[PDB]
Design a protein around this ligand. Structure first.
Ligand SMILES: O=C(O)/C(O)=C/C(=O)c1cccc(O)c1Br
Ligand SMILES: [Mg+2]
Ligand SMILES: [Mg+2]
Ligand SMILES: [Mg+2]
Ligand SMILES: [Mg+2]
Length: 712
């Protein structure tokens, strides 16, 4: 079952995959590759373990500090000086500008949605890569952005009252984004190109654009184009003109659809949205990443570039696919896909850098044309780092991998998640540690909330999970991230990103509220579906992010004291029914997510909460819920009987929600026989003892336990 290379014992399925699938076409010699793996693992594992031990030592000191605190209001001056003494809060370096070069325009310049998808799901990954262009009509008709009120309800058949509202919404979008010199797109009867500029026919007169430079191109004949291509805030809009179509036949100008450039970049996720606990799982993911980079992943295939005629009459093309990042796992976990001679598992983050890096070489070379970075970069998101020494380690790991792969130094770029408190409070130093590799920072606010709870676990009971979004610490955290990014010269060089919209069915709400993120100067933010990407694209047409960033330059809007404000609840805060609701809600969301993780290896699941809101769950939202209940149990807000009773009460409700689903095995009534139930319980009752409250140690162990049982 294993292959010996030096000190390593490689699972045969991984050895075969790399030799037969990943290496051919890279001109890397297999024996040299595997010797490189052995040397990188041997050389870098000590520092990897040392960093993990440092996390544990720091947390132990903070725990003890809070237990020895007498004064009720935390003396913030004493707290801050303590974090400085133990090396948690480090000195801020002098101002600098990042030097990362060779980065694609989608990252340096284009503000727009960033889509995250589990790499183990080939169909979702394909749809994500293809989500660079998406139908606004479909996004509006298929979601609640257009209310299902007055005869506008969806049904088995196309509803023209609803379709007309879709059309009107899109016409107002055009008026607001590419305004006519006079009149409205709602009254357009036709489009032509005359002397290289767009002419819109109105019933009374004709008109051009208020800014004719927004006219980017067209398809078909200039006198009766089959489509018109507009650009606004660097994002493209395509009006499809087809009077013979069913929609276009009813349209006053024969418009069939409005196509939005949507998911500019996509993150193919190996981390919190997938369940991969052994070599077999990792190979499934690596193979999908390989198919994406070679261009031949198919279930349904990857799109080619798009051909246009320039306003002046020449030819040009536009990228048809989303520019792909890969999210590697972070520094914590090992995986038995490789073990050493003594049987120790190899760090999974090290493996991901080698193998996803190797596979990404295919995306730098011809498919027809090369799939991904035309400028020669490989884009890796590195999650869950704690402070600048951990960022420096990632950079050293990437350097060593580049040597093994024979790639130019600094080929492998890094998207830094700002999703751990020791990174937040040292963010300037963290960016500087990666100043020649960094291509984004992003506030992973869900992980950051989990780390907020775990770090101050001993200080007292935290506010309810739903209250966290309005706490001083998180508002400071979001502003601080933008400030540090802009201060490091990110405008025009690297993305400043914000976090995930999880309410998959509440697209009217997303359109209403997620505009806050580009208004806050973020040049990208996360969505979980191609449809959400198309709708979030609307916000970048309304908000001039480049303008917003220029206005924000130089501002210092968060103090260290605000960043360090612990989200403690006030005494007497909750009635029994409020406590009960928090416990039930958290138990339901935990059980709903964990049961499909452990029994079916699904790392991202839509789970209705106690208010029947469909939430896209992954490990970070699980980290919050389990840590909050662990915190409430730790400080006596709830008893161990309360937790067990809530889990038992919500488990059959999860069983019912899954009912069919044929691979689903119920948790109730024999709770002590359900590995999934016991994993959910363990995440709560052992939550305080998990490193930084991470969920992977328990999830991976319980999933492997489930697989072992299904094997015998
Ligand atoms: O805020 C973080 O810590 C972060 O990393 C976000 C996620 O990973 C996430 C959360 C929910 C659904 C989903 O698809 C994803 Br990708
Ligand atoms: Mg302890
Ligand atoms: Mg995260
Ligand atoms: Mg509260
Ligand atoms: Mg504008």
């Amino acid at each position: 079952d294993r292959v010996s290379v030096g000190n390593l014992r490689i699972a045969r399925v991984l050895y075969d995959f790399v030799n037969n699938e990943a290496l051919p076409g890279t001109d890397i010699d297999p024996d040299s590759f595997w010797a490189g793996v052995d040397k990188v693992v041997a050389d870098l594992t000590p520092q990897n373990q040392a960093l993990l031990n440092a996390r544990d030592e720091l947390q132990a000191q903070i725990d003890k500090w809070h237990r020895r605190r007498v004064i009720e209001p935390i003396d913030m001056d004493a707290y801050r000086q303590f974090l400085t003494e133990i090396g948690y809060l480090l000195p801020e370096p002098d101002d600098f500008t990042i030097t990362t070069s060779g980065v694609d325009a989608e990252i340096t310049t284009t503000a727009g949605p960033q889509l995250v998808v589990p790499v183990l799901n080939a169909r979702f990954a394909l749809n994500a890569a293809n989500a660079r262009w998406g139908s606004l009509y479909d996004a509006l008709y298929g979601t609640d952005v257009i209310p299902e009120t007055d005869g506008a309800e969806k049904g088995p058949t196309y509803n023209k009252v609803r379709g007309d509202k879709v059309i009107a919404y899109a016409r107002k979008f055009l008026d607001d984004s590419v305004p006519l010199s006079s009149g409205s797109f709602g009254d357009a009867t036709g489009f032509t190109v005359q002397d290289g500029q767009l002419v819109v026919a109105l019933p009374d007169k004709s008109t051009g654009l208020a800014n004719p430079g927004q006219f980017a191109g067209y398809t078909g004949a200039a006198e009766s184009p089959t489509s018109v291509l507009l650009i606004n805030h660097g994002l493209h809009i395509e009006i499809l003109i087809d009077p013979e179509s069913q929609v276009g036949t009813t349209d006053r100008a024969g418009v069939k659809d409005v196509i939005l450039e949507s998911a500019i970049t996509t993150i193919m996720d190996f981390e919190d949205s997938v369940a991969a606990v052994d070599a077999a799982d990792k190979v499934l993911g690596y193979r999908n990443w390989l198919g994406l980079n070679k261009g031949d992943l198919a279930a349904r295939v990857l799109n080619r570039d798009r051909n246009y005629t320039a306003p002046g009459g020449g030819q040009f093309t536009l990228p048809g696919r989303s520019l792909m990042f890969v999210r590697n796992v972070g520094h914590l976990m090992t995986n038995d896909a490789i073990v050493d001679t003594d049987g120790s598992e190899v760090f999974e983050g090290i493996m991901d850098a080698l193998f996803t890096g190797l596979i990404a070489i295919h995306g730098l070379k011809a498919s027809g044309p090369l799939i991904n970075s035309r400028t020669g970069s490989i884009y890796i998101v590195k999650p869950k780092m704690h402070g600048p020494a951990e960022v420096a380690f990632t950079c050293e790991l990437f350097s060593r991998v580049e040597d093994v792969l024979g790639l130019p130094q600094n080929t492998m770029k890094i998207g830094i998640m700002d999703e751990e408190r020791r990174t937040t409070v040292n963010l300037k130093a963290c960016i500087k540690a990666a100043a020649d590799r960094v291509v984004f920072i992003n506030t992973g606010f869900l992980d950051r909330t989990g780390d907020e709870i775990h770090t101050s676990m001993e200080a007292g009971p935290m506010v309810r999970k739903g209250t966290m979004k309005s706490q001083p610490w998180i508002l400071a955290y979001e502003d601080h991230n933008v400030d540090a990014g802009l201060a490091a010269g990110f405008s025009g060089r690297a993305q400043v990103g914000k976090g995930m919209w999880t309410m998959t069915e509440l697209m009217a709400d997303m359109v209403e509220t997620k505009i806050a993120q580009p208004r806050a100067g973020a040049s990208t933010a996360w969505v979980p579906s191609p449809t959400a990407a198309t709708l979030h694209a609307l916000h970048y047409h309304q908000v001039d992010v480049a303008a917003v960033q220029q206005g924000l330059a130089g501002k210092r809007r968060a103090t260290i004291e605000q960043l360090l404000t612990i989200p403690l609840a006030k005494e007497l805060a909750w009635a029994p029914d409020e406590i009960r609701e928090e416990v039930d809600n958290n138990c339901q969301s935990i059980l709903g997510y964990v049961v499909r993780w452990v029994d079916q290896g699904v790392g991202a699941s839509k789970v209705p909460d106690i208010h029947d809101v469909a939430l896209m769950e992954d490990r970070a939202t699980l980290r919050i819920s389990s840590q909050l209940l662990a915190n409430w149990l730790r400080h006596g807000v709830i008893t161990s009987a309360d937790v067990r009773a809530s889990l038992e009460r919500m488990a059959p409700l999860v069983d019912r929600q899954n009912a069919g689903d044929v691979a689903y095995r119920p948790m109730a009534p024999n709770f002590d026989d359900s590995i999934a139930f016991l994993a959910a319980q363990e995440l709560i009752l052992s939550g305080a003892q998990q490193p930084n409250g991470y969920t992977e140690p328990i999830l991976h162990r319980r999933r492997r336990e489930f697989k072992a049982r299904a094997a015998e």
